[PDB]
């Protein structure tokens, strides 16, 4: 533990050991000072231009957290190609974390001349929330992850939480959390910090698409022994009367055969086309969207439950808020074009799940009689019925990994809608902050708190190692499969590589489901 | 491990132990920052002025490597005189490497006043590629070696590689290598780095010239028992007719005797003279050169295979691209004069190898009859025949040492054409880089990567120790040999010494082959 | 399949220390005569570099 | 006996894949008359190593 | 597979009426050139003597 | 010998001397009752199938 000795080594590697894979990643961070070492209250009112659907109340802290809840922070694009091509499932087992090589520097601004010098005696504060006594921010899909490309230097986010509100006003059950009421460890330069975590039991992630559909599970050569009603009216001529006729399911009437299972649930959404000439000439993004109503607030169901995107030969349709939409390099924040984003498609799960822009089915409406025709009724949203089967949404190379299940009384199939692994005890948050150093205090005493500080920042390394467990492919299919490949022809720049200016870019989203298993 | 303690000692010595020699060399390096910590794509197109023979595609990295693949980095000019005068061969056995005394400094430019101050807490990154997972740059004869003279301070090169191309455009099999995806060690000031390597089994380097030729291996006093066809036409007068006459090889017809072996291969080149009045009045360096055609590219066969340079009494001729050409002190890059370069000559191997500017032989062309004269045909390039013998190209005091054999399916006598030792597992590359240190980040969060850094550089020592194995001279020759000597008469400055301004210079190339062995 | 070719195994950023014959005829005008000129292999004349 | 792939390439490789769009018959399968057929030659060299 | 190497030579007949009326033992022979000396490739590499 | 086109006939070329190609096989010359037995291989850097 000295100033002339490094406290870690740059580990960044991945090994494959048959039924495991251990990945390591190491980046370089830099931490500013937030809020000038102050806690602040933030809120937004119904007054002005804001509406009732967008009010909030909460706090903003001087601390900063670490968010590595994303898939490409650990996997190189080659190592993601090895994973999706040969494996039917993967789940994580344990992780490890390590901070080292802390450097604290100060900056002095005089007459426009900026001078940056070392400060050998200042500290930082790091700790983990192991007992889950804070709000949980990760898993709400925010920015500020580790960079995809290891040769980048990133910036640490800011921590802030939310509580209850009535408009822009707090109520009696609001809560104020002081992060300095927790035991934390202080590090001068030449110290390090590390801990160890172990994931709980979690089901595998289905990295396959079914090669068989629910309504085509029978035998094409044998009739059934089990009848169905087929005819009610005779066919002699003008004098058609009532009758009861029955028949058997066979090879040619395969929509009438008796079946054992149902498709998954359906919560129908609006269909919009990427060819712009086929849409309506109106602004229907918010007025026609699929919402849900909680506490007098219309929040948007986004992306909703896991349903299929489009049926066959209709690749130009997508639900208005039903897919994950990823942005390319240098896309603007507001009003990006169509060619600046990348649309993901969930077409693999159309064998069991319903289509997100079409109805679930048709049910009856009245009691038919001799003088009353039978009426039908279309169901738009259908809850869970006994005998249903479904699939979850796929994970991506740049998608999230885990989310925290809220500590409630009950839940129903707790998988996150954005995909990944639903945990009841997620990895803990890691909060970091520079300790304040005051400027010169006055010579005479004054009871007020000090508000003149030395402006500082700090930088250093970080290392995350996660061990994954795999499930091998054990199929007896004769013809070849579908794999992920690179493009073959010549092009201006290499995909998944640097530019001529030095900006890394990802050309397309990469799914997971490429191998096939039967139902 | 502290700031007030050196971490190494200046070892620079050579010892002789009968059948070994252990040489050590120590220099002082300095490393800048490359590309401003960025990866970049570099290429060259057929458009503009460039041609199809000179296109490339590749990348440029922020790292820097160590190249000691040259003979004078380890051998003093005296110790090279001890080697070539008493030994018939030498090969290397093992090496050792050591970095120490790291100093990281920073520079701040304000109003033209340049101030350079210490930075006690910054690191560098060094590692070796032991498993050969990178492109191999060494052995392509580049600059940036250790200096010949130990009192110099040198500068570390930059790493960059090449891949496939179609013009100036990448194809599907191009590859992008991120050097930060390897495990590397970080060193503050007061740390050191060292490893150990062991060469594989490699044949000796023939440090001799043969004192006997292939076509003069017989006995000058005894005829042969084995005949040859000598006469076809009688010699009576006008009435000469056909006959068959035979004779024996003897002491006076020694070109007709039966012989056991062939000369080496031949790939003929163009002859040019240093006396300028004897050349053609045309520009024939590229249009008349000896090339080889790969993938629609005319690349120059340089220096081609090991052939002799000139026959006797013709010391003014040399092949246009068949010799290694070395530059003197302060030679220009483009259009140097004749008096600014030094031409090496391979005249020792004329006893077995063919001459590089003359043909290999004469073969038949048709089937002679009573009404058809026999025709002959000259062979310009000849592949390997059974029974051939040859010699390799010589190594020099300022020539390379090793080269990497490409990992392919087959090869034929894998010695490098520039001379030296063909290895399948060469010494590993050693890549070094300063870790980036950011400037002050903004107070509010921003997802973009940081691109404002503190400008730095770093310096320190380096030490290489290689052990060589020798093969002694065991001849029974009566008259004295030929040795390497210094000039005897008075002169203005000492050869192989410093100037009056302080610039070291090498006056002439020094070969190896001085002692003699019989065939 | 190899991802690298035989005539492109060098470094795109560093010249060589090893020369090659490049010019034989001068370029003043009508009175072009014989000369010997040499140069180094570099990043832009990569067909002229010395190869193994 | 096999020899595994031990490369550190960043971007993805080239693999052998099946065709994706709809077609009349499955490749590498039987006909409607019962004759097996191979549609194309399949090489071996798809992964890459440096020289 | 391929046949072995070939270094072609001149054909002469023992029936004397079928040869040329010239002295071609040295001027038409198969030689090899070493160090400015035309030595005779004798007997050369192992090739077959005559066909059927 | 060349590249045939719509307006260019294909040409052929006869090889008189051929070096070693991959996949060749050959035999050595026979020994005789009054022929030699051994020969010394010259101490050199390389050789190719050192039979006399």
Task: Indicate the domain borders of chain B.
Answer: 1-519
| Preferred mutation among F16, F19, F21, F26 to probe E, highest tally of E CBs within 10 A | F26
Q: What are the residues whose beta carbons fall under 8 Å from the beta carbon of B257, sequence distance 6 or more?
A: B218, B224, B228, B249, B250, E42
Experimental method: cryo-EM
Measured CA to CA, the distance from residue A363 to residue A378 in angstroms comes to 6
* φ, ψ (nearest 5 deg) of residue B181: -95, 10
Distance of CA A336 to the CA centre of its chain: 21
A437 within 8 A of A453, measured Cβ to Cβ: yes
Cβ burial B47-77 (10 Å sphere, 16+ → b, else e): eeeeeebbbbbbbbbbbbbbbbbbbbbbbbb
Residue B278's φ and ψ, nearest 5 degrees, are -100, 5
User: From start to end of A234-285, where are the E strands?
Assistant: 242-248, 266-267, 271-273
Backbone conformation region of residue B112, classed left if phi is above 0, alpha if psi is from -120 to 50, else beta: left
Residues E42 and B228 sit within 8 Å (Cβ to Cβ): yes
Map tokens 């149902």 to a residue.
Answer: A262
Terminal-residue alpha carbon distance, chain A: 59
Of F19, F43, F52, the CB nearest to B385: F19
Query: Which member of D13, D16, D29 has the closest CB to residue A486?
Result: D13
| CA B209/CA A342 separation, integer angstroms | 70
A168: left (phi over 0), alpha (psi -120 to 50) or beta: alpha
Mutate to test the interface with B, among D3, D5, D8 (most CBs of B within 10 A): D8
Q: Do D45 and C1 touch (CB under 8 A)?
A: yes
Measured distance CA(B269)–CA(A149) in Å, rounded: 50
Mark residue A252 as left, alpha or beta (left: phi above 0; alpha: psi -120 to 50; beta: remaining). alpha
Question: How many Cα atoms within 13 Å fall on the side-chain side of residue C36?
Answer: 23
Give the tokens for residue C32: 């072009």
Name the E strands within A14-157. Answer: 14-16, 20-31, 40-44, 56-60, 64-65, 87-110, 113-118, 124-128
Q: Where are the beta strands (DSSP E) in chain E?
A: 6-7, 31-34, 37-40
Distance from CA of E49 to the nearest CA of B (A): 14
In chain E, the residue whose alpha carbon lies closest to the alpha carbon of F22 is E2
Q: Which chains form contacts with chain A, at 3 or more CB pairs under 8 Å?
A: B, D
CATH topology of domain A1-519: Empty Capsid Viral Protein 2 (2.170.30)
Put simply, the answer to whether D50 touches B134 (Cβ < 8 Å) is: yes
Cβ within 8 Å, pair B360-E28 = no
Two tokens at A41? 């209250």
Residue A161, number of CB atoms within 10 A of its CB: 15
State the count of interchain CB pairs (< 8 A) between B and E.
117
Largest CA distance in chain D: 49
Candidates C22, C36, C41, C46: best to mutate against B (most CBs of B within 10 A) is C36
What counts of helices (H) and strands (E) characterise chain E? 0, 3
Q: Which of B58, B163, B418 sits opposite C52 (nearest CB)?
A: B418
Contact flag E28-B368 (C-beta cutoff 8 Å): yes
Residue B454: is it exposed, middle or buried by C-beta count within 10 angstroms (0-12/13-18/19+)?
A: middle
**Does the beta-carbon distance from F28 to E46 stay under 8 Å?**
yes
d(CA A43, CA A163): 10
Place of tokens 């039908």: A376
Contact list in C for residue B56 (CB cut-off 8 A) is 8, 12, 43, 46
Nearest alpha-carbon partner for B144 in B75, B58, B68, B34: B68
This structure's resolution (angstroms)? 3.3
Cβ contact E1–F21 (<8 Å):
no
B518 interaction partners in chain F (CB closer than 8 Å): 43
Q: Which two tokens stand for residue B320?
A: 């246009």
Q: Is B7 exposed, middle or buried (0-12, 13-18, 19+ CB in 10 A)?
A: buried
E-assigned strands of B32-119?
40-44, 56-60, 64-65, 87-110, 113-118
Question: Hunting for tokens 């009968």 — which residue is that?
Answer: B18
What CA–CA distance (Å, rounded) separates B222 from B250? 7
* CB-based contacts of B260, cutoff 8 Å, min separation 6: B387, F39, F52
Are B107 and B116 within 8 A, CB to CB? yes
- Chains D, F in contact, 3 or more Cβ pairs below 8 Å: no
Q: What subunits make at least 3 CB pairs under 8 angstroms with E? A: B, F
Residue B141's Cβ-side half-sphere holds a number of Cα atoms within 13 Å equal to 26
Do the beta carbons of residue A117 and residue A61 sit within 8 Å?
A: no
Closest CA to A43 of A234, A174, A219, A205: A174
Subunits with at least 3 CB pairs below 8 A relative to chain B? Answer: A, C, D, E, F
What are the strands, taking DSSP E only, across A204-275?
Answer: 209-210, 227-233, 242-248, 266-267, 271-273
A262: which 2 tokens? 């149902």
Alpha-carbon distance of A215 to B502, in angstroms, equals 90
- Report d(CA B90, CA B208) in Å as an integer: 11
Nearest-CB residue to D51 (from B133, B172, B407): B407
DSSP designation for B80? H
The C-alpha atoms of residue A428 and residue A65 are separated, in whole angstroms, by 11
* Rounded CA separation B307/B346 (Å): 8
């Amino acid at each position: 533990d000295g100033v002339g000795s490094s406290s870690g080594n740059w580990h960044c590697d991945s090994t494959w050991l048959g039924d495991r894979v251990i990945t390591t990643s190491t980046r370089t961070w830099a931490l500013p000072t937030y809020n000038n070492h102050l806690y602040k209250q933030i809120s937004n009112g119904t007054s002005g231009g804001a509406t009732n659907d967008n009010t909030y109340f909460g706090y903003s802290t001087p601390w900063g957290y670490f968010d590595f809840n994303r898939f490409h922070c650990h996997f190189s694009p080659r190592d993601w190609q090895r994973l999706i091509n040969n494996n039917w499932g993967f789940r994580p087992k344990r992780l490890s974390f390590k901070l080292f090589n802390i450097q604290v520097k100060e900056v002095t601004q005089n007459e426009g001349t900026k001078t940056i010098a070392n400060n050998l005696t200042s500290t930082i504060q790091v700790f983990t929330d192991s007992e889950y006594q804070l709000p949980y921010v990760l898993g709400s899909a925010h920015q500020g992850c580790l960079p995809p490309f290891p040769a980048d230097v990133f910036m640490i986010p800011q921590y802030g939480y939310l509580t209850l509100n009535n408009g822009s006003q707090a109520v009696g059950r609001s809560s104020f959390y002081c992060l300095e009421y927790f035991p934390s460890q202080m590090l001068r330069t030449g110290n390090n910090f590390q801990f160890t975590y172990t994931f709980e039991d979690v089901p595998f992630h289905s990295s396959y698409a079914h090669s068989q559909s629910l309504d085509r599970l029978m035998n094409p050569l044998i009739d059934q022994y089990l009848y169905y009603l087929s005819r009610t009216q005779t066919t002699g001529g003008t004098a058609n009367t009532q009758t009861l006729g029955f028949s058997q399911g066979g090879p040619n009437t395969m929509a009438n055969q008796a079946k054992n299972w149902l498709p998954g649930p359906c919560y129908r959404q609006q269909r919009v086309s990427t060819t712009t000439g086929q849409n309506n000439n109106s602004n229907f993004a918010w007025t026609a969207g699929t919402k849900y109503h909680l506490n007098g607030r219309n929040s948007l169901a986004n992306p909703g439950i896991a349903m299929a995107t489009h049926k066959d030969d209709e690749e130009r349709f997508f639900p208005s808020n039903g897919i994950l939409i990823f942005g390319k390099q240098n896309a603007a924040r507001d009003n990006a074009d169509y060619s600046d984003v990348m649309l993901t498609s969930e077409e693999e799960i159309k064998t069991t799940n319903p289509v997100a822009t079409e109805e679930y089915g048709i049910v009856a409406d009245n009691l038919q009689q001799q003088n009353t025709a039978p009426q039908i009724g279309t169901v738009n949203s259908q809850g869970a019925l006994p005998g249903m089967v479904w699939q979850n949404r796929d994970v991506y190379l740049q998608g999230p990994i885990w989310a925290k299940i809220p500590h409630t009384d009950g839940n129903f199939h707790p998988s996150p809608l954005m995909g990944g692994f639903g945990l009841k005890h997620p990895p803990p948050q890691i909060l970091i902050k520079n300790t304040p150093v005051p400027a010169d205090p006055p010579t005479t005493f004054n009871q007020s708190k000090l508000n003149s500080f030395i402006t500082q920042y700090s930088t250093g390394q970080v290392s995350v190692e996660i061990e994954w467990e795999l499930q091998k492919e054990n199929s007896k299919r004769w013809n070849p499969e579908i794999q992920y490949t690179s493009n073959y022809y010549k092009s201006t720049s290499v995909d998944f590589a640097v530019n001529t200016e030095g900006v890394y870019s990802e050309p397309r989203p990469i799914g997971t489901r490429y191998l096939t298993r039967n139902l």
